[PDB]
Symmetry: C13
Subunit: 96 residues, 13 copies
């Protein structure tokens, strides 16, 4: 399997969520892995064998899914959430 940190660096993930400290690397990495796993299964593209195979648009969707996990931590929320269409669209363009 592909390690998400070989596709998008840990530093870049932290920049996405504007998080400067190094004391949540393990939690952040879990969100990154969850996001990558989600996007890879959704795209379902058996041909991508290595980190360098992942298209830039899929990388953008990974950052959106990841950032959503960092900011929205509960399965139910008090404030209504709205789908940002950009995530599906970045991926749709590369689904099997």
């Amino acid at each position: 399997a592909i390690d998400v940190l070989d596709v998008i660096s840990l530093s870049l993930f932290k920049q996405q969520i504007e998080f400067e400290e190094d004391d949540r690397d393990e939690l952040i990495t879990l969100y990154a892995q969850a996001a990558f796993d989600y996007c890879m299964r959704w795209c379902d593209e058996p041909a991508w064998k290595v980190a360098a195979d992942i298209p830039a648009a899929v990388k953008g969707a990974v950052l959106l899914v990841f950032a959503d996990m960092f900011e929205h931590r509960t399965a139910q929320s008090e404030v209504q959430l709205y789908e940002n269409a950009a995530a599906e669209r970045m991926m749709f363009i590369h689904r099997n």
Copy 2:
């Protein structure tokens, strides 16, 4: 059966909810176990035999379900709750059909 704390450490569960105190470990552990039990039954995947088998997206769902339990303590509330789609979506892609 798989122990949820071998999949996601108690330390990580506490960071999910930004909870620093150590006097609620038993309650927090119960929420973690409940969330894991729920996500496992829902995915219904027999081939996940050990903790290392659990996919990252499923780990993401357990964290969301766990934090919901921690934050929302009553079966009815005065304020409406809205489903966060990420939890079911994280689980759906690892569902045994």
Copy 3:
């Protein structure tokens, strides 16, 4: 039959509702026993013979139902209450 306090201790029930006093254990027990009876009958799973048989997701539902009775003491209220979907979903996956 199963004593709810063998499944979830009274101190956990008190922590669920962040209740620190020692003078409401009898009332709190009555709520806990009601929540457990409700959830047990709803799942209707006779394979749970002893306390250690109760699945973790059902314990979660019992705590939610319990906390509801603690917080919402009247059969009617002036403020509309909304069903928290987590209770039913935690029970559903273990219904007989």
Copy 4:
């Protein structure tokens, strides 16, 4: 007939409504008797012959109905009241 106070003590009734005073024992007793009568007739279970026969979930409904009588004293109100579904779900699970 069963005496409601053999099922849930007067002291527990006063704790439900957080009522500290001792000068309303007759009134409170009347509400308790009314709530029990209502929940009994509703469940319609002739199998329950002694106080000990009353299931925990029915005790919870009796507390909810009792407290509603204590707090909401007129057949009409200037503010709409909303049914708390817990009371009838607690009873439903034991309807004959």
Copy 5:
């Protein structure tokens, strides 16, 4: 006929509406008689021959109807009144 005050004492009627004075006893008695007449006619149970025949749930309905009379004095109001469902439910459970 049954005398309503043999069923629910005047002093209990006064506690229902939290009324302290002894100078509205005639008016309060009229409301109590009207509430009782109302509920007796609605229930239409010929088997209720003496005060002690009246069930607790019906006593509860009588108190609610009585209190509404005490609080809401005019046949039209400038604020909408909403039916409190408890009164009818208390009665329905003993209808003939």
Copy 6:
């Protein structure tokens, strides 16, 4: 012989219904009382009530509600909407 309202409910009780403490409006209050009774009697349309004592307590409750409304709401049109209090008709309806 038409039943007199003041043999059914005293003026004292009419004044307590509206929380009216003064004694300089008995004539006006009597007229409202008589109007309310006339209305409730004709609406119930029960000739079986021959004397004051025949009038059921729930109907006396209705009479007080109708009376109090006349006292408080003096005009055939209002700048604020009025809403019917269901208690009035419900207590007449059962008779």
Copy 7:
């Protein structure tokens, strides 16, 4: 043709509108006459031949219509007027 002031005195009309001045007797009389004429035509009862014949509910209606004239002076207004059902209901029960 009946004189309204034989039915209800000018001073009772003034009490209806809580009007304590003596400088508007002619205007007030006109409103009184208008209200009486209106209610009489509306009921259309040929049996009322003298002031003593006018029933109590019709006097109530006349007072309401009179007061409306006193208070609301224009065939059109800036603020919406709502019909007080009491007026029509008082006359209806004596329509011929």
Copy 8:
């Protein structure tokens, strides 16, 4: 033709609109005449030959229409006008 001032004096017209000045007698007279003309035509009753023949309810309608002309001077307004139902009801009761 009937002179409106023989039916309702100028001073009664001024009391209707609570107007206490003498410098608009000519304009007020015009509104009075317009209101009378309107109501007489609407009623269409040939039998009213002299001032004394005009019924009191119709005089009531003439006052309402007059006051509306006095208060509301433009064929269009920035605020909605609402019809006062009394005007047409007073007239309709004597229509031919």
Copy 9:
């Protein structure tokens, strides 16, 4: 053709709009002429040959239309204008 100023003097038009000054007599005369022209064509009554033939209710309408011209200067506005029904009703009773 009838001169509107022989039907309603310029001084009365000014009082309608509570316009004190004398420096707008030409504009005001123009509004008066337009309103009269409007009302005359709408009524279309050939029998009206002289100023004295114009009925009082038609004069009322003329005053309303005129005042609307003086107050409302633009074919479009940012605030909705609402039709005052009195203008049309006053003309309606004299339409040929």
Copy 10:
């Protein structure tokens, strides 16, 4: 063809819009001419050969259209404009 200034002088157009200054005669003239051309074409009555032929109500409509141009300068605006029905109604009665 008819010059608008032979029908309504510039001084009257300025008074319509309460415009004091004398440095906008050319612009005001353009609005007046645009307004007249519009109203003349809408009415489409070629029997009007000279200024003196133009009916008073049509002059009223010209003033309203003119004033709308002076006050509302753009083909689109951020605030909704509402039609003043007076303009069209005053042209409608002289339409050919």
Copy 11:
């Protein structure tokens, strides 16, 4: 083939928008040209060949469209724009 500035001078266009500077003559001229080009094409009248041929209502529309481009500079806005009906009506009156 017609120059807009021979139809409406730059100085009038500037008065339309109340713009008292000379440092935007080129931009204003461009708006004026675009507005004229738009209205001419829209009316599509070959029979107009010189500046003096263009009717007054069309000059009015040209000024409206022009001013709209001066005030509203973007193809999309955060605030809804509403069509001023005058622009289309001024033009439609002279459509081919």
Copy 12:
């Protein structure tokens, strides 16, 4: 084939957006080129071979589309954008 800055100068583009600085020439030029490319493709007119061929209304549309790019920088926004109908209407009259 045609250079946009041969049609509308950079200086004019800056005046459209009221941008006085000199440090965004490259970005502004990009917006200008994009706007021009879009309008040209939308009209699809092969007869326009050189800068001078571009009609005035089309230049107005280019300015509008340009300014929208300058002001609205993102493919989605927190605030709904409303189409300004002037852009398409300016282009539509020159569409192939």
Copy 13:
């Protein structure tokens, strides 16, 4: 095969979002690459072989899609997002 930075420099991308700082260059590069990839696949014009082939209207769309990524960082938001029609219309004109 075309690198977005050969089409629109990072400097111009920074200007688009009015961002002056020097420490988000790898993040901005990813957004730019993602925006280009998306717009290119959308247009599906394989006749554009080199940087200078890309039409200005497509460059405008790439800037819009880029800036959206920079400003709206989560797959779900608490505020509703509305599509800015300019992005699609600029792309559509070259499909």
